[model samples]
Target: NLYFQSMSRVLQAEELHEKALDPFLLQAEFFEIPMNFVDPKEYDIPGLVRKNRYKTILPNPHSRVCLTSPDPDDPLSSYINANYIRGYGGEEKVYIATQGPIVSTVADFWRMVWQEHTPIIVMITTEYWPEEQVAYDGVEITVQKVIHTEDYRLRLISLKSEERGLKHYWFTSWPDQKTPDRAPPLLHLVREVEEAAQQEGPHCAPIIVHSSAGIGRTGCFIATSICCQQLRQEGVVDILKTTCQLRQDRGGMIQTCEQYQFVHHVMSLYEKQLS
Candidate 1:
């Protein structure tokens, strides 16, 4: 009967306010729900590309962020393991959900960032080792400043010739194949990123979000940020529809039920803090 119900859950502002006090019921239902992961083989172009860290985690070509340099006419030159992800209020280009750059794709990854003029990079899992400068695609980016926080790390980077500023948020505590062991810190990080994004102003470029494969924990962070904005603006949250919207942009937004439940818990904490 539940699966038979409409995929969207339309709730009054008051309804969400009440239900969010305790997320167990919501978690039970959310964790048990199902989402169909797109078959990578469906898109033969993005499918066969070996640069993908995980073959099964390919981006949907419809919303993919393609590289324009080298030769736009070349298929391989245009391919990048990233997608243009919408954020709160269906705003286009709010974020770029991408996979962690492997050895082969590191230069290409930086090329995408330079092409997009991304203002912020949200590194959810992989560690950023010491590097004075990164040069690729005939562009050079240098680490300008390093800022540390209780929940996440921020790196201020700059383009030498362009005089452009970029920020990177490295959240290191997320465990692999599972959500963060605690919910409060994750919620705090979400709020922190949201505020930082606002400071970048209206014309700010898309924020790049990446983890190992770019779907599991990456999806959770993107979904949580969108839901937090929704909660702030509308006094309500629609986790169901949010998850669906994310998948539409790029398949398998929230990869596992455990990750889904973790989002519910994070939302619940946010509601308590709001009160």
Candidate 2:
């Protein structure tokens, strides 16, 4: 057995909490001996300091989940590109970054934001910076207990998060609605982007939206937005090339079939003008 110590840091659980707020293994703590953690389903954390400020891919996922994101500190910007935005493999790895569906996934998303002199936390109902194996320090470190699916699909996460000097605004990704045709409100999301863009005007940081594997929901949003921008700027050719180039960069620029459909939905909007 390796060296270990019991942790006293905890949160009182007198009431029920959302699993979206729970992230099991997401701390960058230094301790002796090898340590690891995992989850199977959504469960009650009972006692853990949840945080809406964390995102998924920033931590180490290479061993556990099937997805991964390179260090945002890289200079080439090649690693942070679209290809690894979320990563492939059905590891069911969820990405939670400080920013919304946009921005780079550096070691600490907060660190990047702090670098820009804009330290803000963007909260999401489902997306969480789930982590496992928290270090037992003499001091208190924020953490939330959580569970996940076999394929890395998240079942539930705690809705509560711990914060000291940080503030967050909630932006739902997979918003629950009875009506299938209903589109989630984008006012908050748009505001986050606007604020982020304003924080770094001109150079313009890439808004990275990550769900499971930079595919499916992730792909849909990326394609749709870029397509919209393209249609507004150029037209059919531009949109097609953009999407195709993404595909070329890495197969499945569209990711899942449904994602492609979402992109099509945006493209269709421009098609209407042609007819």
Candidate 3:
């Protein structure tokens, strides 16, 4: 059953601190959120197995991004393992949460970029590009400039299908450990991406975000992005509600209890910075 539960009102700064520290409460709440993963049986199309990196991590049918394929009758041709994730305030199609591009799906990945007219890509994981340029599915991707910061690498890329600029931020500060040792680098990347998106113009195209599995670390990044806005505009954050919303769109977001707690810690730090 996929009954969507309504979340309570936003939390205040004080409540945010309390919840972030309560591992027991956070863990319990984390477990209760529906995984919403698609059953393998749900997708019966032949050759569809190769498109997904993981058998259990299929995109939810309702929100899945269908690629425009010439073979309209062939469902497999139009399938891509990606979903449209809502942004803060329930804005539609603000981001596309997807898995990292494997060798087989690399062309399809670029095709999605061209199809969506995405202006930015935030990769929690990387290594699908050369130093200069690459072309896929009639879309030409050129690496115009590369900027290296303490926490991440920024690539100024040009997509020459219809001529649009794409900013790829490969975040490198995520520690080798389960969670980050500190929150500032993630916060900094979030702020930088937001600023870049704002500069992209009023109606910025959907930003592409991906990790290896497109759930755990990907979910954490998306959750942090949303909560940062909530904290800035509303002076509070509701990570529980945010997590629910993310999972509702794409299952297993913030894939572990530890990541859930990590999001809270990041939000708490943001709240402190604001005051």
Candidate 4:
């Protein structure tokens, strides 16, 4: 049985400032956080290797997102390299963390989207679609419009099967450098996406987020979103516990020491904005 662990304490808004400034403390804490990664040997199903972008970065078994339409006996047919991640306060299925769709898994990606009834997709990376429209399996995805912003691009797409609309936020401002040059653009993108999710209603399906291997940048974005909500509702944030919660669901989330620190900087900036 899977369970969410309760955070020990919530740091006040003032404490957040002190914590973010101490890089050494943050680094030490980052090292102590568990990776909770899955053993590659656990996935012995045929053709499973081709579905994953990275062998060691498999989704945690309890939170794995199983494709519903595939034949039950043929486990390979139902496999997808993704996991259902909880949101702030341990809300279930708030987000789905997945890998960038490879050539073979592109159709599986859209199939998951349609099956999940996902309204928002935050892509750290795309190229699984054509210029204006594309069909995967039975779903027809048409690009309705695209709005480019300084840090991210928003695409309004329509799914013909269920007559539903989807929002695809392509965040490109993440620098080629290991750490981001600034925090404001990322914060702006986070706020913008949260507002969009809110408009989708409380019960909207999980917002899909993905990067190359689905852990590094994807973890940062999801952690920041959870921490921001925690800051808003309680005037405090528990990023350490949030990261742990994420790792419990998906292995190797918040993939680097720099990314963990970058999240702190973003929260520190967010706290400043609140004041």
| Model 1 stretches with alpha carbons more than 4 Å out | 1-6, 11-36, 43-49, 126-130, 175-181
* lDDT for model 3: 0.85
lDDT of every model, 2 decimals = 0.77, 0.31, 0.85, 0.86
State how far residue 201 of model 3 sits from its true place (Å). Answer: 1.1
Q: List model 2 lDDT by residue over 1-275, tens digit each.
A: 11123231111121101111222311111121122211212212222112112322222222211122233433222122123222111111112222233323433333332233322333333322435322111212233433232212222222212322222333445434312232323322433444544565454333435453443354444444444444444443232334443332333334333333334433443344433
- Candidate 3 per-residue lDDT over residues 1-275, each given as its tens digit: 24478465478999888888888988888887888888879889998878889999989988888888555467888888899999998899999999998887888888888888999999985367768998877778899999999999999999896598889999977755444357778888999998998998888889999998899889999999998998888888888788888888887888889888888888888888888
The estimated TM-scores of all candidates read 0.86, 0.38, 0.95, 0.95
lDDT of 1 by residue, 1-275 (tens): 22223256644455655554445766665654455455766666643466788877788777888888878877777888899988887899999999998777877888888889888888887333337786666777888888888768888888754677888889987854343348777788888888888898877789999989888889999989998988888877888887877777777778877787677667766766786
Whole-model alpha-carbon lDDT for candidate 4: 0.86
lDDT of 4 by residue, 60-102 (tens): 8889889988564678878899999999989999999999999
Best-to-worst ranking by lDDT: 4, 3, 1, 2
Among all windows of ten consecutive residues in candidate 1, which has the lowest summed lDDT? 1-10
Which scores higher on lDDT, 1 or 4? 4
The 10-residue segment with the lowest total lDDT in model 4: 1-10
Candidate 4: segments with Cα more than 4 A from true spot: 1-9, 176-181
